[PDB]
Design a protein around this ligand. Structure first.
Ligand code: SF4
Ligand code: SF4
Ligand code: SF4
Ligand code: SF4
Ligand code: FES
Ligand SMILES: [Ca+2]
Lengths: 586, 905, 145
């Protein structure tokens, strides 16, 4: 049985436990290609099911995702409860290495759900986004305000009747009254944000213009002297509407938009989308495709980690390793330009493979990079990372344990510095990552800034090892799958065969027809766990594209970890998270 | 009937075959050679499924779903491995000889063969040998021929010969060298040959008029509209790119014009793309032509209309109901004149009285095909109402259909049906002044003057029912033919009488009404069909008003010092000299039109109105069904200087500026509500289409497909800044792809058919409730009137027989599908298909005049001598001269008139 | 269908010849000696059957010329791998019920009987490697293993 087959997952022990606890008629099991058990739970039993999953012998401890779906235009809803809207909750049990997707059906008029924040604190931002984009009200939320769009915005963007394009709307006119009105909206008021204010609590504004490579955003700070008593991040300043474009572009033409989700990730961002689309299409890619995609993912991972370490060192105060790390990034960029033809957004992965074959001479450039990198990395450590001033700025700053990382959905180096060995490449292997010998570094139990930075250095070394294994063992074979839905087909057969020309003609003009199904793929990105949840209605466009990013979780974890610290501690914590605002807002 | 497809139970119709039943359930089976309108032949061998004998069967056998009835307790599998492999093998065999032609093929992105190649999953070529080739033929100005792309599915020959009744297209040759086309290079002679561009699943037959300015299907802005080239009212999908009307596609209407249009509607759209059309309001000041925008045009027109003592409005049957009503409100009901002549108006009002007061049901265009005997009186149906002629051909083949039904042969097995009913056919009796195109299937044809055709109808009605007035002076041969017609009509369960106003005789319509009443009095299920002239002739007749002659006398007597002519050239309904003199006498002439007419030189103000491609409105077809047509594109999107509005918008803004000195344009639903409130006879036009607030789950209806391209580059030469998307406040459609075009959406107006995996015109199968039936949530359009409880009385005005008087020549009307329509002659692609202007003469009349065939003779009508070449019409009765109506210089009101000093030039 | 020396001791009835994998037919047997190549004989048979197709239905009309061209390639020793698999699939998909009439099952009966009994003569024609595409400069091909 192939890995893309539709499964109901009735053999999962959680399904039997829920049968024994709530009864057989309490919920509906849905067979999907997501790989997870999808259970349609009634709305009034949602908190009971959440408590039961949180109190299992091996509990479901992390709310991976929480969002909504407009089911009004969905025609192929066979075997599903009647719904105008739906809210889905993706929950991960790490001890079982399993996960479950609860779904709550909602009518168009009664768009209210009990809030999930009493079980998982990341439901705050997740439900704020679900209210902002779908209009679904969550009863009991401490503050249900818009998180992506401004407060003076009419309508909910992710509804199916909301027009997507800016050309549908009037063109942007900036008048004096409009500038004054929008400048009034961006002003901060203590009472509206739930600050809950002593005649000394001053207020500090950080953004929204940001002198750093990772986006533009605001943090409003409540200060007692220099101590941060409370803070709430202001996001949505980098909102690009990428999921609405997922509903607006075809399966093949959406890949450049998948590139700019985490713009330091590139092919790492392309990987889960093409894997989920191949799950929708029933495509198993050959081994050469898997090794090529692993090689490019590790190259872009080293690029992102180099930028992150350089930016952290610059934010500490040493400004020379950013120059040297960008030189190493230029070496990586030389190899990436040779392979794909572009630097930061290659858009080179395809449904069924990659756009081209590897060019002649890729092994030479990979050899130069593999010889160049480790001495430069050792010089980085000895020059800046072992500096005691940097250690004093970094060690013990904004520290949290395993419980705080689990309850806030923090993944990547922040989770693994708490001692939790959870990498997607080893727990739920994808794209032939089980054929590569590499280790997953873990921390002692405390997630300092310094511990996260040293962990990312360790994953840079492990990615260099994976790149060496890719260089030594690259199979000879096709760079594209032989499936009929491989988009586009191989170019020369398109250029001399009429049936291949027909397939290419219809795949690049109207789009390839994915059969109506739901698919899901989570990967270990450069900054944590990045996932694509794709709902297809049988058309050539995605019915729903849900992109889960870890930077959302880390920016939400900021107020819990930086509370009671200094402003410079906040700057160091921002520099040591490895986020980008495109990942947060997307 | 109960079928089991892939283990799932379905309830279907046992009279259907498995292919149409499975397509009606939403299942996907590839097919080429089967068409819903043409039946099953089992040629392409593409629709193969695996049938099992019982439920506990594993082997099965490959059967063909188009050739297998969907009987009760059937067990089939589509996704069986052997069936899938065979369908992929059939696609592969079709792909062995196919040219590498998709980029340079007009069917690309709209191709059924592309969709079925992708659907079967065939994308790897292992055939390594040569491909057969074919030379192409010249098939005329409308159809482009490319025989390399053929897959030998026999759809073209089956449609063209069995369905359309054409003769000049056929299949030639042998084993793998089958050729589909004409026996020699020449123009395709069928009036419905343009449907080959949608019948052919490949790019062998293509729209050459579209192939000139070609663009792909995904790049088209589509709208649901009504064809304006005659009175039948076929539903069309006009598609536009870069500000010009690119194509006309057949929009499915199961009640009217299901799969097929005629050539005049499909290729006569070229007047919209003319460069001489008015695009801005122009005011004449001496020898100067000042171009204004809409506001100062309304201000100036309001001042000149207010200074006038009496304003009159001349409408047209070309314009919509809303525009004629807006003109009628602007000038007043008593000052509103229909733009047609007095005789035309009398014939049209008599036809309306027969339709909505005669107590006899008027069938729809699809319902015509279910009648058992057809009598056509006076109307050349193929040249005036061509789709009615196609439906008449289907009704004629109904006898072979019922003969095969009597032998327990299924209705989709068309080859056995045609084999059983070899040449037996339902009775068809056509009357005209000469030969018609229905003569090949007619049981009888009467070539006689209009008085003699009317007398034949009156004699038929008297012989059917003796209470009808009798005719004295019937010859024994004519009496025998009348007895044959009466014996055929009396024995028919569903007789149909087809007449119209194009014959130019009131007595023909009276005779047809008498025949219909006599057949109704015997208890038969008689239907009557009246063929009008223009698209909204019935609506203009229902709205009413004075004739054009009364308006001309009002202009000539000086009682009216201001005339507003709405979309009327005025030369087709009256003599040109009289119209020109009456318009030159009036101190204010305002012409609201979308075409450069001849009366615009004398016009003081010209309002650049919109055509059907740039306007919304309602038109009433020949059966009294109100139908809403929607705007295709914004004219001012590309050319920002273009001020071209709807005619009702122009006139309503003019009325508001005349009353209150302020400019309010309208919304369309306001005009619809005003029509319903003021005219109770036109109260049904509100329910023709839903209003502008109609939404499908909150979103509007998309005019263009979801993969529409070039949005940031279509206007980049004018300005790199992307303009505002055109807003449509009038209707529920949007000028964008951000809308709904789902096949399961609860609506009746479909701009275009597209489904995932179905890019061809076969997506209409996805848009129907059952394949070949109606639209899923009802066809658009509503009948304005029901059948009356009681009928009319017998028309006792039996005309005298035609007497050929010396020195006077009765003008026998001749109509041409390419040339008689006012707007279709303006289309430049028609001039190659438009015939030369001749005049028809009897052999006896030509011998008396001493003229041969081809020589030029000159005749004077209303003091205007014009010369024409001569053909010898054998079937034309002596004492008559045959003129082609609607031509250049020959107005359609000349039908039934008389001619003086017709002599050789 | 062709039959061998072992089938010569069979009565010429419909049921007897039908049970041996052939048909009684017109009962006018035609004998092939050792001097006749089976590939040339089947090529002659399929050339007749392909040029006597009526052109109505797809599998006969568009698959008999493919078998003719494959057998011509096998005759001159220009056969490529997968040709005999293509011939066997043409046999399987041109059987009864797949084509509109019974001309193509009778066409493919000698081909399948000769492939069944004399496959070594058909193996001898496959000499060249399989090549359907030519090289296009600037595009690296998909090297399907
Ligand atoms: S007819 Fe269809 S398959 Fe053939 S060349 Fe044209 S688009 Fe391609
Ligand atoms: S020309 Fe077109 S419709 Fe006619 S047989 Fe060929 S593919 Fe079919
Ligand atoms: S029959 Fe009349 S309405 Fe129909 S397509 Fe032809 S011209 Fe248009
Ligand atoms: S199998 Fe028969 S019907 Fe089909 S093309 Fe061949 S000879 Fe004609
Ligand atoms: S559609 Fe049935 S064989 Fe062609
Ligand atoms: Ca409009």
């Amino acid at each position: 049985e192939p890995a893309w087959q539709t499964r109901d997952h009735l053999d999962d022990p959680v399904i039997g436990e829920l049968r024994n606890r709530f009864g057989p008629d309490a919920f509906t099991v849905q067979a999907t290609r997501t790989g997870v058990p999808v259970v349609w739970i009634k709305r009034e039993q949602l908190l009971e099911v959440g408590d039961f999953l949180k109190k299992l012998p091996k509990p479901y401890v992390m709310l991976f995702d929480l969002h909504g779906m407009d089911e009004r235009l969905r025609t192929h809803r066979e075997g599903l409860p009647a719904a105008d809207f739906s809210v889905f909750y993706h929950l991960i049990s790490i001890d079982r290495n399993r996960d479950i997707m609860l779904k709550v059906a909602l009518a168009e008029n009664d768009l209210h759900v009990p809030t999930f924040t009493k079980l998982f604190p990341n439901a705050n931002w997740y439900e704020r986004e679900t209210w902002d984009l779908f209009g679904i009200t969550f009863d009991g939320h401490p503050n249900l305000r818009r998180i992506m769009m401004p407060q003076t915005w009419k309508g909910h963007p992710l509804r199916k009747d909301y027009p997507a394009r800016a050309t549908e709307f009037s063109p942007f006119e900036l008048t004096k009254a409009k500038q004054d009105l929008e400048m009034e909206a961006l002003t901060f008021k203590p009472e509206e944000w739930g600050m809950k204010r002593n005649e000394d609590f001053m207020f500090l504004n950080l953004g929204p213009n940001h002198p750093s490579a990772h986006g533009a955003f605001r943090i409003v700070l409540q200060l007692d002297g220099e101590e941060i008593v409370d803070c709430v991040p202001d996001i949505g300043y980098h909102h690009r509407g990428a999921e609405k474009m997922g509903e607006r572009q075809s399966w093949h033409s959406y890949i450049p938009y998948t590139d700019r989700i985490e713009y330091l990730g590139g092919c790492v961002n392309e990987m889960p989308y093409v894997l989920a689309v191949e799950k929708l299409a029933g495509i198993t890619v050959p081994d050469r495709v898997n090794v090529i995609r692993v090689m490019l993912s590790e190259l872009f991972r080293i690029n992102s980690h180099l930028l992150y370490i350089s930016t952290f060192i610059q934010d500490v105060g040493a400004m020379t390793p950013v120059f040297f790390a960008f030189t190493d990034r230029q070496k990586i960029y030389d190899l990436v330009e040779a392979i794909t033809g572009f630097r930061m957004h290659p858009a080179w992965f395809r449904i069924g493979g990659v756009a081209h074959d590897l060019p002649r001479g890729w092994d030479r450039l990979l050899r130069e990079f593999l010889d160049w990198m480790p001495k430069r990395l050792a010089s980085y450590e000895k020059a800046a990372l072992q500096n005691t001033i940097l250690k004093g700025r970094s060690q013990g700053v904004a520290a949290y344990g395993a419980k705080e990382a689990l309850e806030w959905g923090t993944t990547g180096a922040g989770l693994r510095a708490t001692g939790i060995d959870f990498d997607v490449r080893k727990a739920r292997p994808y794209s032939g990552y089980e054929n590569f010998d590499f280790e997953i570094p873990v921390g002692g139990g405390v997630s300092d800034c310094y511990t996260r930075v040293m962990l990312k250095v360790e994953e840079l070394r492990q990615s260099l090892r994976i790149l060496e294994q890719c260089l030594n063992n690259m199979p000879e074979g096709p760079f594209k799958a032989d499936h009929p839905l491989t988009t586009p087909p191989p170019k020369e057969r398109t250029l001399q065969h009429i049936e291949t020309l027909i397939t290419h003609f219809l795949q690049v003009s109207w789009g390839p027809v994915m059969p109506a199904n739901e698919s899901f793929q989570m990967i270990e990105a450069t900054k944590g766990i990045n996932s694509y949840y794709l709902t297809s209605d049988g058309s050539t466009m995605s019915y729903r594209t849900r992109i889960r990013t870890p930077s959302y979780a880390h920016l939400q974890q900021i107020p819990a970890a930086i509370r009671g610290s200094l402003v410079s501690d906040l700057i160091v914590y921002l520099g040591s998270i490895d986020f980008v605002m495109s990942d947060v807002d997307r | 009937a109960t079928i089991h497809v892939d283990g799932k139970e379905y309830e279907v119709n046992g009279a259907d075959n498995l292919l149409e039943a499975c397509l009606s359930l939403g299942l996907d089976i590839p097919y080429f050679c089967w068409h819903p309108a043409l039946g099953s032949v089992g040629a392409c061998r593409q629709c193969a499924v695996k049938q099992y004998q019982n439920a506990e069967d594993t082997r099965g056998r490959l059967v063909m779903s188009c050739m297998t009835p969907a009987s009760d307790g059937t067990f089939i599998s589509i996704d069986d491995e052997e069936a899938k492999q065979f369908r992929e093998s059939v696609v592969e065999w079709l792909m062995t000889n196919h040219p590498h032609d998709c980029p340079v093929c007009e069917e690309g992105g709209n191709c059924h063969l592309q969709d079925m190649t992708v659907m079967t999953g065939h994308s790897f070529r292992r055939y390594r040998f040569t491909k057969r080739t074919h030379r192409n033929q010249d098939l005329g100005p409308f159809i482009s021929h490319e025989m390399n792309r053929c897959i030998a599915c026999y759809r073209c020959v089956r449609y063209y010969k069995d369905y359309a009744g054409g003769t000049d297209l056929g299949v030639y040759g042998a084993h793998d060298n089958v050729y589909f086309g004409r026996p020699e290079d020449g123009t395709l002679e069928s009036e419905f040959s343009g449907n080959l561009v949608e019948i052919c699943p490949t790019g062998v037959f293509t729209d050459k008029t579209h192939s000139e300015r070609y663009n792909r299907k995904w790049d088209m802005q589509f709208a649901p509209s009504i064809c304006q080239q005659c009175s039948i009212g076929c539903n069309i999908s006009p598609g536009e790119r870069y500000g010009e009307l690119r194509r006309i596609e057949n929009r499915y209407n199961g009640t009217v014009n299901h799969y097929f249009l005629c050539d005049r509607g499909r290729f006569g759209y070229g007047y919209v793309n003319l460069k001489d059309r008015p695009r801005q309001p122009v005011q004449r000041r001496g020898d100067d032509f000042i171009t204004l925008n809409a506001e100062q045009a309304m201000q100036g027109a309001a001042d000149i209309l207010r200074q006038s003592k009496k304003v009159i409005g001349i409408g047209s049957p070309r314009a919509s109901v809303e525009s004629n009503f807006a003109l009628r409100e602007l000038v007043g009901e008593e000052n509103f004149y229909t733009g047609i002549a007095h005789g035309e108006q009398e014939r049209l009002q008599l036809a309306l009285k027969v339709l909505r007061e005669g107590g006899i049901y008027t069938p729809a265009l699809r319902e015509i095909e279910s009648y058992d005997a057809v009598l056509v009186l006076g109307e050349d149906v193929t040249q005036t109402g061509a789709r009615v002629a196609l439906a008449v051909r289907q009704a004629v083949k109904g006898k072979a259909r019922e003969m095969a039904a009597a032998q327990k042969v299924a209705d989709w097995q068309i080859a056995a049906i045609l084999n059983i009913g070899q040449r037996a056919k339902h009775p068809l009796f056509v009357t005209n002044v000469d030969d018609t195109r229905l003569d090949d299937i007619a049981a009888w044809t009467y070539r006689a003057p209009v008085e003699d055709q009317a007398r034949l109808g009156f004699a038929i009605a008297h012989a059917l029912d003796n209470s009808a007035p009798a005719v004295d002076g019937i010859e024994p041969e004519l009496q025998s033919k009348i007895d044959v017609i009466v014996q055929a009509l009396a024995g028919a369960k569903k007789p149909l009488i087809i007449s119209g106003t194009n014959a130019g005789s009131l007595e023909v319509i009276q005779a047809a009404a008498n025949v219909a009443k006599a057949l109704k009095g015997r208890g038969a299920d008689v239907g009557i069909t009246m063929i009008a002239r223009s698209v909204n002739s019935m609506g203009l007749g229902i709205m009413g008003g004075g004739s054009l002659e009364e308006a001309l006398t009002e202009l000539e007597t000086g009682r009216a010092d201001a005339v507003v002519v709405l979309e009327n050239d005025l030369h087709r309904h009256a003599s040109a000299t009289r119209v020109n003199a009456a318009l030159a006498k009036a101190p204010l002439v305002m012409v609201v039109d979308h075409q450069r007419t001849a009366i615009m030189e004398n016009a003081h103000l010209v309002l650049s109105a919109a055509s059907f491609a740039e306007s919304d409105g309602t038109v009433i077809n020949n059966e009294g069904r109100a139908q809403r047509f929607f705007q295709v594109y914004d004219p001012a999107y590309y050319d920002s200087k273009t001020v071209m509005l709807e005619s009702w918008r122009w006139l309503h803004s003019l009325h508001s500026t005349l009353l209150s000195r302020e400019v309010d344009w309208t919304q369309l639903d306001h005009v619809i509500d005003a029509v319903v409130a003021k005219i109770p006879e036109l109260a049904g036009i509100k329910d023709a289409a839903p209003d502008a607030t109609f939404r499908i789950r909150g979103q509007k209806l998309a005019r263009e497909p979801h993969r529409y391209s070039g949005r940031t580059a279509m206007r980049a030469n004018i300005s790199v800044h992307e303009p505002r998307q055109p807003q449509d406040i009038d209707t529920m459609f949007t000028f964008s792809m951000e809308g709904n075009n789902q096949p399961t959406a609860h609506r009746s107006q479909v701009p275009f058919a597209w489904a995932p995996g179905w890019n061809s015109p076969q997506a209409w199968n996805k848009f129907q409730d059952e394949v070949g039936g109606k639209l899923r949530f009802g066809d658009p359009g509503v009948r304005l009137f029901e059948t009356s409880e009681n009928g009319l009385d017998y028309f006792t005005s039996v005309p005298a027989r035609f007497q050929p008087q010396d020195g006077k020549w009765r003008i026998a009307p001749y109509y041409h599908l390419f040339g008689s329509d006012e707007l279709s002659q303006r289309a430049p692609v028609f001039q190659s298909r438009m015939p030369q202007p001749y005049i028809k003469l009897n052999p006896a009349d030509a011998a008396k005049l001493g003229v041969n065939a081809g020589t030029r003779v000159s005749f004077s009508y209303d003091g205007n001598t014009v010369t024409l070449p001569v053909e010898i019409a054998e079937g034309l009765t002596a004492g008559q001269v045959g003129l082609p109506m609607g031509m250049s210089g020959i107005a359609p009101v000349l039908a039934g008139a008389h001619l003086e000093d017709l002599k050789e030039a | 269908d062709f039959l061998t020396e072992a089938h010569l001791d069979l009565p010429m009835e419909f049921e007897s010849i039908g049970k041996a994998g052939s048909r009684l037919g017109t009962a006018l047997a035609m004998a092939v000696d050792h001097e006749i190549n089976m590939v040339s004989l089947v090529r002659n048979l399929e050339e007749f059957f392909a040029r006597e197709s009526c052109g109505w239905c797809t599998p006969c009309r568009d698959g008999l010329p493919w078998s003719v061209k494959i057998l011509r390639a096998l005759e001159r020793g220009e056969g490529q791998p997968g040709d005999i698999e293509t011939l066997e699939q043409l046999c399987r998909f041109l059987g009864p019920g797949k084509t509109f009439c019974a001309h193509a099952p009778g066409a493919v009966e000698p081909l399948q009987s000769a492939i069944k009994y004399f496959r070594e003569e058909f193996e001898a024609g496959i000499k060249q490697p399989f090549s359907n595409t030519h090289l296009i400069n600037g595009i690296q091909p998909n090297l399907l293993k």
